[PDB]
């Protein structure tokens, strides 16, 4: 949907200086470190065999309930749902060469945004955060 609801500007030919930076690959509505995400996933899908109720999960308690509301009667294998939740929560950050656009919405199109000798104007769809602006 983000790709489809996108506008493409002009393409310019000229030098492009790209710097290798650690950037987020895909946008996430909610982002937490892998340990916190794993704890939240265990609470959502396997509450019985979850272990110590770590205090770090407190902030996400409400969220857990929401997820337990959506997956109350799902006949999908629990591991696939767990990895769906990891995709939606766990962040993938990689060192990539970027030039003037590091937001995750732009990293998805990075292959099309620019090379070493050309720039492509791209307007991703959806909504953007105030912090990025």
């Amino acid at each position: 949907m983000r790709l489809d609801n996108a506008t493409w500007g002009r393409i310019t030919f000229g030098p492009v200086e790209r710097v290798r930076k650690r950037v987020l690959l895909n946008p996430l509505t909610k982002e937490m470190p892998p340990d916190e995400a794993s704890n939240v996933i265990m609470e959502i899908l396997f509450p019985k065999e979850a272990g110590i109720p770590r205090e770090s999960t407190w902030i996400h308690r409400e969220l857990i309930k929401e997820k337990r509301e959506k997956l109350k009667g799902t006949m999908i294998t629990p591991i696939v749902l767990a990895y769906m939740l990891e995709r939606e929560l766990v962040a993938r950050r990689r060192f990539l060469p970027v030039a003037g656009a590091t937001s995750a919405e732009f990293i998805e199109m990075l292959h099309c945004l620019q090379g070493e000798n050309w720039r492509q104007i791209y307007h991703p769809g959806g909504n953007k955060l105030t912090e990025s602006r």
């Binding site: 794993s38 265990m42 396997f46 065999e49």
Partner: protein, 45 residues
């Protein structure tokens, strides 16, 4: 998630099945006869 424990797999599985049977019986999932059979099997193990 990698399970953790220094006890045997048999003991963990037996305790898990005992808890499942007891909670099913208390919640009405399991009737009298099936609960008795499960308890007998667990005691035998």
């Amino acid at each position: 998630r990698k399970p953790v424990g220094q006890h045997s797999m048999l003991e963990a599985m037996a305790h898990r099945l005992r808890m499942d049977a007891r909670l099913d019986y208390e919640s009405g999932r399991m009737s009298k006869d099936d609960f008795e059979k499960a308890m007998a099997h667990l005691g035998e193990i």
